[PDB]
Design a protein around this ligand. Structure first.
Ligand SMILES: [K+]
Ligand SMILES: [K+]
Ligand SMILES: [K+]
Ligand SMILES: [K+]
Ligand SMILES: [K+]
Ligand SMILES: [K+]
Ligand SMILES: [K+]
Ligand SMILES: [K+]
Ligand SMILES: [K+]
Ligand SMILES: [K+]
Ligand SMILES: [Mg+2]
Ligand SMILES: [Mg+2]
Ligand SMILES: [Mg+2]
Ligand SMILES: [Mg+2]
Ligand SMILES: [Mg+2]
Ligand SMILES: [Mg+2]
Ligand SMILES: [Mg+2]
Ligand SMILES: [Mg+2]
Ligand SMILES: [Mg+2]
Ligand SMILES: [Mg+2]
Ligand SMILES: [Mg+2]
Ligand SMILES: [Mg+2]
Ligand SMILES: [Mg+2]
Ligand SMILES: [Mg+2]
Ligand SMILES: [Mg+2]
Ligand SMILES: [Mg+2]
Ligand SMILES: [Mg+2]
Ligand SMILES: [Mg+2]
Ligand SMILES: [Mg+2]
Ligand SMILES: [Mg+2]
Ligand SMILES: [Mg+2]
Ligand SMILES: [Mg+2]
Ligand SMILES: [Mg+2]
Ligand SMILES: [Mg+2]
Ligand SMILES: [Mg+2]
Ligand SMILES: [Mg+2]
Ligand SMILES: [Mg+2]
Ligand SMILES: [Mg+2]
Ligand SMILES: [Mg+2]
Ligand SMILES: [Mg+2]
Ligand SMILES: [Mg+2]
Ligand SMILES: [Mg+2]
Ligand SMILES: [Mg+2]
Ligand SMILES: [Mg+2]
Ligand SMILES: [Mg+2]
Ligand SMILES: [Mg+2]
Ligand SMILES: [Mg+2]
Ligand SMILES: [Mg+2]
Ligand SMILES: [Mg+2]
Lengths: 206, 243
RNA sequence: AUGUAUUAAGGAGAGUAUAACUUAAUUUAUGUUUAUGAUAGAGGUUAUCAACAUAUGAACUCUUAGAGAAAUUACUUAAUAAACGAAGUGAAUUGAAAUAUCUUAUUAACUUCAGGAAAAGAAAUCAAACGAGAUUCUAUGAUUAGUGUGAACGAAAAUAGAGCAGCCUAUUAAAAUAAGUAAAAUGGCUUUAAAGCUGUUUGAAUAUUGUGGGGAACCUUCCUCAAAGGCUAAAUAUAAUACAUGAGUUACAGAGAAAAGUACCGUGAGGGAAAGCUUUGAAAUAGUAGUUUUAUAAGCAGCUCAAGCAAUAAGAAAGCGAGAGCGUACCUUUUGCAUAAUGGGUCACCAAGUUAAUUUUAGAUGCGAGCGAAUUAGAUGUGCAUAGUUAAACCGAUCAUUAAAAUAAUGAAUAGUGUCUAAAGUUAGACCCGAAGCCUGGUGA
RNA sequence: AGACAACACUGACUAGGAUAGCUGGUUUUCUGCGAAACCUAUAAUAGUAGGCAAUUUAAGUAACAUCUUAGUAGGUACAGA
RNA sequence: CGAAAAUUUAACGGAUCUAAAUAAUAUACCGAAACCUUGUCCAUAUGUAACAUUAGUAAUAAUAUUAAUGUUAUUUGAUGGGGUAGCAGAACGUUGAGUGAAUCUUAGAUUUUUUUUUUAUAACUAAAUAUAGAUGAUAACUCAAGUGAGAAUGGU
RNA sequence: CAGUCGCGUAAGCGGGGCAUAGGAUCACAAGAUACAAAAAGGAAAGAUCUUGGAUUUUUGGAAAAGCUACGCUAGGGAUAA
């Protein structure tokens, strides 16, 4: 944010009269009351509202994005899935929650219990780091599930991901379309004149 | 352990921070590298100050003036023009115009007051092309024609060169005709285009008109001259003989 | 602190159910939902055990009729702060290492007038032979053009963003298109000599069928606009209120004010505090207790040598120390200080090379004759480098002097660009603290 | 009487706007190197600038210092009239 | 002998000395933080070996190796060692921040003390007192500074 | 080195004086140069080269008299009571 602020001797309240005479009182000669040497005087080099942001080349920022995406690929922590990446919550619960029979206290108490036991079977929960789900759009089940059970992981939208978010959890669970759009938006250094970007080797057996 | 707790810049990128006024052992302690009670310790000296002695620019004076009317050409050589064609970045079969010289990158990413074709590497240039620039050196005009090409020097400004890249103006190697026997054909063309295109300006001053009026520069106004006529709008070729 | 939204007159005196606010100082009614809400009881003083929305009774005195020593008199359905805005008048400190022009500065201040904003505004504008198309706000353009002996001062076109709106039949009522006007001389202002503002004395013309203004001395052609009449929202300024955010503060901090312009000081204008909570308990200082030394001695109280004392007990000696020697505090400032040269009663806390823009360098690293930025199809948004040369253009791997030229002579030629870390030059308070003075507005006999 | 005009008067008090080539102060440790008080210019001599020149670390060295051997410039001590 | 000054012997430092004075010689000894020797610390080198971390490259169903960085040892029985103004390098500490929805804590996290150890502006061992499950503390690496005070007739 | 002049039989000499004692910029003025010309054609005002007028004599270049015993501030105590 960088909004911290402090008052200098030129902003502190009060009059700019001289405190004690130049000579005659025997004490150290003093000027105005807003000097830093006084009790309520201003801080000379105090913080001020300024901009802390720096610059990073688009090409260097894109290389850092594909380096964090490859650091996960070689370690097996990049698990891409198909589209429609949402938590497969039971149908009965969804029918009751949508209907309104279930109160909030029970609707939330269940999502927390199910998401915890679902992530533990997959070895994807708090006992094994955590997981980050990156999807193109916001899905109710997923984003709502990881809002009540946050110890098991989190969910993010493709536009809400940074280079620091890929490196902050145990695993990255990303969608096929999300990845194709994630590497296609950060290949500035590559696309300057193409390379394989989503080339299909084995097709889904419909 | 964690990756975010194991990142750092190369050691060669970090440098010592000198905080003055923080103890004797630091090496920048009391005086803070200022000396002892001078003007450089108490206040600030004017940078232009030399102690009182007059500077040399006042003892000699400033020499010359800065020409504020000279055109800022975008220099282009033949050694570099041949490299773009061998790489396939400039089509030699089509006319090479400022729109295609600025969008290819040969002259850079800055559009200046014109484009001048120079003659560096004129010995290894053997590609027949049809180039159009604002100027051309004597060695670049005959080097382009020795290979079997054609060159024409047109008049451009900084604004007209920008409209050519933006497509707001169509390129043409001919000046606007003059007379009542051309309105019917020129106005015909404007309607057909079905767009608001701007026109390329023609020279107006004496020097500008004369530069593109002589065949030495291959000016696009050279067709207005007779073989015995001179390019200058004031001087004339005297006649040789006894009379 | 910034951002968003909303709003566009403020204070005091006295009184009162001490969460409740005006002599009625806890008024009286509606509608809806009420635990699946909203965000089958007890309880009218043993009260307000109900929130939201919409209405509603009451609301004193002064500022504020007249007078006066404001909160009184006397009457009566008497009533509008500050900041922000425009114009008028207009300094000085400061810089130029003095100082007159200049800078500070179309500044501070004062004076009048006006509104929730005001001002300005739909070209007698800019451009340059192509064209743009009102005003206002922000950045770039620009430590530029330019001015000036200097120090310094300093545009416009254009570009990008915020807003966008045009008109005279103005959405609130206005022109029969502007004459003592444009302009000239002269005295000033502004400024580059133009354009613009102006006191004195003078004084024009009537539309592209080329009349008039401008295009930076000036004349002409061309271009361009149409003064001497008007209307116009938004983006902008300030204050109040509410909310959001925080590698902002957490009590000598934050604000001057966690009960504050209050207590207190001053005839007055004016100056202007301290003080959080139930937690923790540092140092200095004081009175004692244990161990140890001390009444023959001339110690910056430390250091080197060290007898002895010191644990009821197997084991375990920190501490104090007689006696011997060495040692004339610290800092600052100086050629040089134990100096009888400067500074300090002790301890705790506060207290000084920082930030911004700009211009550089080193190292590291990205791209690479490109870099950076920025974006179904296309365009758009500063910059630096890619070529040198001269006073300058022409010219150009060649250029300049040689009054013609010419290897006659002499000089100059080849990886840039962005980012981060650090150190820097420049301009800003500019590492911190400290004058006497000068100017303007007020106060007091 | 340079007298008085409310602590202040060779021109009061109060608020707003300064500079100071002068003085004082500038806070943790370790490591490497290590000066000068001279010349020139300056309304300058308490300042400043350019040198000499301290530091950093790269490229160079027929580097620099000292001695030996041969050579060269220049007139002091001394001695003399 | 000449040779006289005002606090006190008053320029042998003093005691004292007939040499323990003076002149010409000789030898031993003492004597500095100088030098030597044996160790230590630090700075800069030069090759080699080994250990750890990180990142590659190969091998493995019957581990080896390459590079960078840290570290110890060792080769040349390597060289070097005062310091103001000043210049430069390398670190520690303080406050806040990320990794952190992490790690640890009545089997005692935390306790301004005391104590112990380690080439040590720092942390650590133990002890004593009190009692916290996080509005607690925290390694490592990194990020930003209102970051370090015996000195301003400084201020509270 | 180029240009083109003098003297000398020639070699050759000549970019003032046997040597050592005469200040810029700015402004201004007179010649040349043909560089740029704020819409354009010219011009004005600029630019280069040569040259001139200077107790610019504080001669690296201010247009410049004193008093304060009523003095003020910041300092040094270059010894000033
Ligand atoms: K420095
Ligand atoms: K000092
Ligand atoms: K001056
Ligand atoms: K200029
Ligand atoms: K005028
Ligand atoms: K306070
Ligand atoms: K205490
Ligand atoms: K500080
Ligand atoms: K008096
Ligand atoms: K040394
Ligand atoms: Mg004042
Ligand atoms: Mg404060
Ligand atoms: Mg940073
Ligand atoms: Mg460095
Ligand atoms: Mg030092
Ligand atoms: Mg220095
Ligand atoms: Mg100095
Ligand atoms: Mg002078
Ligand atoms: Mg009245
Ligand atoms: Mg009244
Ligand atoms: Mg601007
Ligand atoms: Mg009119
Ligand atoms: Mg006029
Ligand atoms: Mg005119
Ligand atoms: Mg006019
Ligand atoms: Mg009009
Ligand atoms: Mg902070
Ligand atoms: Mg505090
Ligand atoms: Mg005794
Ligand atoms: Mg002295
Ligand atoms: Mg004493
Ligand atoms: Mg003393
Ligand atoms: Mg004292
Ligand atoms: Mg501090
Ligand atoms: Mg160039
Ligand atoms: Mg010396
Ligand atoms: Mg001085
Ligand atoms: Mg002789
Ligand atoms: Mg004696
Ligand atoms: Mg030694
Ligand atoms: Mg030594
Ligand atoms: Mg040392
Ligand atoms: Mg403790
Ligand atoms: Mg102190
Ligand atoms: Mg002209
Ligand atoms: Mg003009
Ligand atoms: Mg002089
Ligand atoms: Mg001289
Ligand atoms: Mg002296």
């Amino acid at each position: 944010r960088g909004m911290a602020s402090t008052k200098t001797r030129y902003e502190v309240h009060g009059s700019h009269k001289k405190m004690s005479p130049q000579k005659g009182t025997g004490n150290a000669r003093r000027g105005t009351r807003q000097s830093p040497l006084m009790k309520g005087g201003g801080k000379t080099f105090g913080p001020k509202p300024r901009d802390f942001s720096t610059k990073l080349n688009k090409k260097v920022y894109d290389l850092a994005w594909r380096t964090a995406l490859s650091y996960r690929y070689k370690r097996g922590e990049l698990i891409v899935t198909e589209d429609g990446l949402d938590l497969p919550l039971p149908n009965d619960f969804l029918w009751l929650a949508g209907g309104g029979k279930l109160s909030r206290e029970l609707e939330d108490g269940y999502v927390r219990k199910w998401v915890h036991e679902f992530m533990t079977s997959l070895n994807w929960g708090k006992e094994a780091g955590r997981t980050t789900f990156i999807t193109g759009d916001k899905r109710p089940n997923l984003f709502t599930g990881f809002e009540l059970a946050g110890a098991e992981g989190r969910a993010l939208e493709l536009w809400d991901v940074d280079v620091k978010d890929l490196l902050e959890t145990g695993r990255i669970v990303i969608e096929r379309s999300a990845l194709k759009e994630m590497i296609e938006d950060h290949q500035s250094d590559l696309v300057t004149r193409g390379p394989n970007l989503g080339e299909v080797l084995v097709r889904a057996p419909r | 352990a964690s990756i975010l707790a194991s990142l750092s810049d190369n050691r060669g990128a970090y440098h010592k921070r000198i905080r003055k006024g923080r103890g004797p052992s630091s090496g920048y302690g009391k005086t803070a590298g200022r000396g002892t009670k001078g003007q450089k310790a108490h206040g600030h000296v004017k940078p232009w100050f030399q102690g009182g002695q007059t500077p040399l620019i006042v003892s000699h004076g400033r020499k010359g003036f800065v020409n504020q009317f000279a055109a800022d050409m975008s220099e282009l050589n033949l050694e570099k023009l041949q490299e773009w064609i061998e790489a396939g970045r400039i089509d030699p079969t089509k006319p090479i115009t400022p729109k295609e010289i600025i969008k290819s990158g040969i002259i850079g990413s800055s559009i200046k007051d014109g484009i001048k074709l120079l003659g560096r590497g004129k010995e290894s240039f053997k590609i027949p092309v049809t180039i159009t620039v604002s100027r051309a050196s004597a060695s670049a005009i005959e080097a382009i024609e020795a290979a079997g090409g054609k060159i024409v020097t047109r008049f451009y400004t900084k604004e007209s060169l920008k409209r050519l890249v933006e497509g707001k103006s169509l390129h043409t190697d001919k000046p606007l005709p003059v007379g009542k026997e051309h309105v019917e054909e020129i106005l015909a063309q404007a309607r057909s285009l079905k767009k608001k295109y701007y026109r390329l300006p023609d020279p107006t001053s004496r020097w500008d008109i004369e530069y593109y009026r002589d065949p030495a520069h291959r000016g696009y106004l050279s067709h207005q001259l007779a073989p015995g006529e001179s390019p200058s709008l004031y001087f004339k070729v005297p006649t040789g003989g006894e009379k």
